[PDB]
Amino acid sequence: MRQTFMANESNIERKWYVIDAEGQTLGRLSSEVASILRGKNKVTYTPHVDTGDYVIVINASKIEFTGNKETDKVYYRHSNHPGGIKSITAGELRRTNPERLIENSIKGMLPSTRLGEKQGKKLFVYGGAEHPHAAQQPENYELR
Amino acid sequence: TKGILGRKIGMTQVFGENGELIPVTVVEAKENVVLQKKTVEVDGYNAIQVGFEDKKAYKKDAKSNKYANKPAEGHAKKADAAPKRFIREFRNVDVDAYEVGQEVSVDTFVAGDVIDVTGVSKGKGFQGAIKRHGQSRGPMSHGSHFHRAPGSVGMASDASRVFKGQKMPGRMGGNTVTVQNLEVVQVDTENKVILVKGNVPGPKKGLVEIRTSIKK
Amino acid sequence: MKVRPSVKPICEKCKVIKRKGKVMVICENPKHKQRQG
Amino acid sequence: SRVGKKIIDIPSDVTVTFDGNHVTVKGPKGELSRTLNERMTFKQEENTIEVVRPSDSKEDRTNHGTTRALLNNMVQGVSQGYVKVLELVGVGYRAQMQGKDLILNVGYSHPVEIKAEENITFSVEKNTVVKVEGISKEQVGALASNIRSVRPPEPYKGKGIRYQGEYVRRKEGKTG
RNA sequence: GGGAUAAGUGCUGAAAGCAUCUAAGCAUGAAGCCCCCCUCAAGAUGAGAUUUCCCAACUUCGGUUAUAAGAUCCCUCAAAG
RNA sequence: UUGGCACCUCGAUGUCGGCUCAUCGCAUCCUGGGGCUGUAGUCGGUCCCAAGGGUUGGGCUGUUCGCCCAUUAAAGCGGUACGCGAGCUGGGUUCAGAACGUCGUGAGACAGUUCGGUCCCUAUCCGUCGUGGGCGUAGGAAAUUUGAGAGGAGCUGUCCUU
Ligand SMILES: [Mg+2]
Ligand SMILES: [Mg+2]
Ligand SMILES: [Mg+2]
Ligand SMILES: [Mg+2]
Ligand SMILES: [Mg+2]
Ligand SMILES: [Mg+2]
Ligand SMILES: [Mg+2]
Ligand SMILES: [Mg+2]
Ligand SMILES: [Mg+2]
Ligand SMILES: [Mg+2]
Ligand SMILES: [Mg+2]
Ligand SMILES: [Mg+2]
Ligand SMILES: [Zn+2]
């Protein structure tokens, strides 16, 4: 007998969290945040709807790497023009655009679906300790 | 660092102090007024907005761009100026040296100033690869059926496509163009004209923007 | 500089060192400078 | 690490004070402050200091030796200072003082100016013996190295700027 | 011209009492990298910013309405096509 | 590269060279930076970093190559269906004519030669170069704009002085 609960927009409640990147490892913080954004931490998780929460990440500039990733991890992109490869190292990207670093790391751990795009749009990253979302009343979230 | 707006009148020549022939462009740069002052605090960057060439006042049943509409009239009246035909910002100037409503006379530039001139190049319409991109023709004889064609657009199975940036026929000219390191030959304050050494982009009557040259 | 997979002393004054992950020989004799590669 | 174990002797005129890792040594000639390895402990005696490492790991031994050497260098720099002497070889190769800056004429079509830095003093003798004096051994070495690299010694006649005790390999320039 | 680098060149420096450009630390170093220069660019759906303009009646009181600012149709044209 | 194999294609995947248009790699020809030298200087030799840009007209030959004339800072080496024939050519090569040498009794034949000898196609899709309309960007409008991104550019001689 079919009895499995299905979340839908009428009964989904999305909260706002704040997570501090300071002293955290890029990938491990990223995987946890991605779980939160997808709603894998809710007993009402329903794959065809977004049951996830909004996440604000602060102190993106204080994320840390192990090994020599700061100089040796290279992000490549292509402009779709011949010879159009451009690269930037992980350390330089942390220096110049830490928000983008965190965002790409997290979004690479979300499915490439319309729903995954929408869920990734609930992510907000800030290099410093302040965010403009006091109006959303976010709760601190402790990793792990 | 200075800036002004003018119309291209045409080309002529002047004889220099040693009798050398100096080709010049005549730029009429009357009726330049500082309409707005943009600042880092309000707008996020510093610049002066200059309006050039008074147009007619707003009227009820206006049908052309000759008459200022109400938004433009309000914007200009805030500076206490008549409405203007062309409006451009200069970021290269010291904003503190200008007041809104100020006149910008051709006398701001002096003979010998090195300047950059920006304009819209003359339009050519739809043009082929030889004219638009300066390519070579094929043979005109020896059995040729390739004269003005653009040539091969790719290779083969690798890459089974044409790459972006391939040069092909299309509209030519009408581009923003900056010519750097021209020189102010003369300033005629009675006629409100600047003689610029050489030639500058665009048709006659086209808007030209003169700035202190960026490279030094 | 001698750049070669085989880096080793050429004379008794040659000194094997390691810099930036590379085996090298430094010596009073400039001919004997070697970097592995 | 014998260097790490070795104790630093403090002259009576030199005072060493620690603020966690960061340390500062004052003496007759000046003050030198720097941040030492955070995992190293310091036994501060009235007249001497000793450096202690926590373990016998490779990193601990290396950092112990270098920390002891650096602190001893700070002490000796405040006490006696450090000096490096270069000399100029070649006809017309001369040096002189443009106040505090050093201007060198060494076979170039232009003179070369070396601007003085804080805590460093240049002195020219006989127009051909330059000396750099300071409290920082590292800074003295760096500035002397810059002076020498302006034109280092060439092998066919030895001309150029050398450290006074430096041995310059010589070569026979011309043969039939 | 600036910033960071390559091969290098060094300073200080231990592991390893010496030595050592390297481990910590500090310099310097290419037409190359990132800028500086020129052009496009907010469909940058993350759709940004500034200045100015317009602003009421009627309503089953959700909403509508033609009008406003404005822009077009149509017409005379060219520096544009 | 010369091959080996015979796996796609024989209800067709056009084949050498040239022209037009390039694009990429670096194992670098020049220009930039270095180490060693049996580097006096001017020159060189050899190796390392470096792919930004640049890297010529002619004589002969179908030629590619190659030799030669004259230059240049230099006259790089390769991949892209030995790039590119629904972009061009058609000299060679691979139809039918004819001929020479040669082989064959002969009909004929020859990576032997010679002279002659039909190169079709109105672009549907992606791709590419231009140029418009719709809606969105939580009121409707006119101007001025930031710059996330993207593209362009990037080469070098000689002489004078020191
Ligand atoms: Mg024809
Ligand atoms: Mg393909
Ligand atoms: Mg060998
Ligand atoms: Mg078989
Ligand atoms: Mg078929
Ligand atoms: Mg290479
Ligand atoms: Mg190159
Ligand atoms: Mg081919
Ligand atoms: Mg084809
Ligand atoms: Mg033929
Ligand atoms: Mg045959
Ligand atoms: Mg015939
Ligand atoms: Zn040796």
Distance CA B158, CA A12 (A): 50
Residue B167: which of B152, B184, B147 has the closest Cα?
B152
Closest Cα partner for B49 from B106, B104, B120? B104
Q: Which residues are within 8 A (CB) of A45 and not within 5 positions of it... i.e. 6 or more apart?
A: A7, A38, A39, A51
Task: Sketch the domain layout of chain B as residue ranges.
Answer: 1-215
Residues paired with residue D97 on neighbouring β-strands, in sequence order: D102
Q: Which two tokens stand for residue D83?
A: 């000096």
Phi, then psi, of D42 in degrees rounded to 5: -130, 120
Between CA D92 and CA D121 the distance in angstroms is 24
| Chain A to chain B Cβ contacts (< 8 Å) | 7
Please list every residue in chain B whose beta carbon sits closer than 8 Å to the beta carbon of residue A82: 163-165
Tell me how far the alpha carbon of residue B152 lies from the centroid of ligand 13, in angstroms: 60
**Stretch (H or E) spanning B24:** strand B21-28
End-to-end CA distance of chain A: give it in Å, rounded. 37
Resolution in A: 2.4
The encoded tokens of residue A58 equal 């602060």
For β-strands B21-28 and B207-212, DSSP reports them as unpaired
Please say whether the beta carbons of D23 and D37 come within 8 A.
Answer: no
CB atoms within 10 A of CB A22: 12
**Distance in angstroms (rounded) separating the CA atoms of residues B103 and B129:** 46
- Owner of token pair 């206006």: B62
Structural domains of chain D, ranges and CATH numbers in brackets: 17-81 (3.90.930.12), 82-172 (3.90.930.12)
Enter the tokens of residue A121.
């749009």
**What tokens does D115 get?**
């601007």
- Reported as half-sphere exposure (CB side, CA atoms, 13 A), residue D50 has a value of 8
Q: Does B164 touch chain A (CB under 8 A)?
A: yes
In this complex, the answer to whether residue C5 has its CB under 7 A from any atom of chain F, a nucleic strand, is: no
* Distance of alpha carbon A38 from alpha carbon A59, whole angstroms: 22
Question: Tokens 């002891």, residue?
Answer: D68
Domain tally, chain A: 1
B121 is near strand F: CB distance < 7 Å: no
The residues that bridge with D43 in the sheet, in sequence order, are: D50
Comparing alpha-carbon positions, the chain B residue that sits nearest to A83 is B163
Which tokens go with A40? 């894998």
Instruction: Confirm or reject contact between B44 and chain A (CB < 8 A).
Output: no
β partners of residue B115: B182, B212
At CA D95, angle to CA D90 and CA D96, rounded to 5? 160
Q: How far apart are CA C5 and CA C34, in angstroms?
A: 10
Residues 6+ apart with CB under 8 A from D110: none
Tokens found for residue A8: 């839908």
What does the longest C-alpha to C-alpha distance in chain B come to? 71
**Dihedral (Cα; A18, A21, A27, A31), 10-degree rounding:** -10
Residues 3-42 (B) near nucleic chain F, CB < 7 A: 36
Solved with: cryo-EM
List Cβ neighbours of A50 (8 Å cut-off, separation of 6 or more): A12, A14, A38, A39, A115, A118, A119, A122
> How many residues are recorded in chain B?
216
Tokens representing B58 are 């707003």
> Does residue B213 contact residue B114 with C-beta atoms inside 8 Å?
yes
Is D106 within 8 Å of D147 (Cβ atoms)? no
Which positions on chain E have an atom < 7 Å from some protein CB?
7-27, 34, 37-40, 46, 49-54, 69-72, 79-81
Cβ-Cβ contacts under 8 Å for B45 (sequence gap 6 or more): B38, B91
What span, in angstroms and rounded, lies between the C-alpha atoms of D32 and D30?
A: 7
User: Do A16 and A57 meet the contact criterion of CB atoms below 8 Å apart?
Assistant: no
Question: What span, in angstroms and rounded, lies between the C-alpha atoms of A141 and A20?
Answer: 8
Which residues form the domain of A38?
1-144
Please give the Cα distance from D61 to D73 (Å, whole number).
18
DSSP secondary structure of A82-144: TT-EEEEEHHHHHHH-HHHHHHHHHHTTS-SSHHHHHHHTTEEE-SSS--S-GGG-PEE----
Contact C28, C18 (CB under 8 A): no
Neighbours of A117 (CB within 10 A): 12
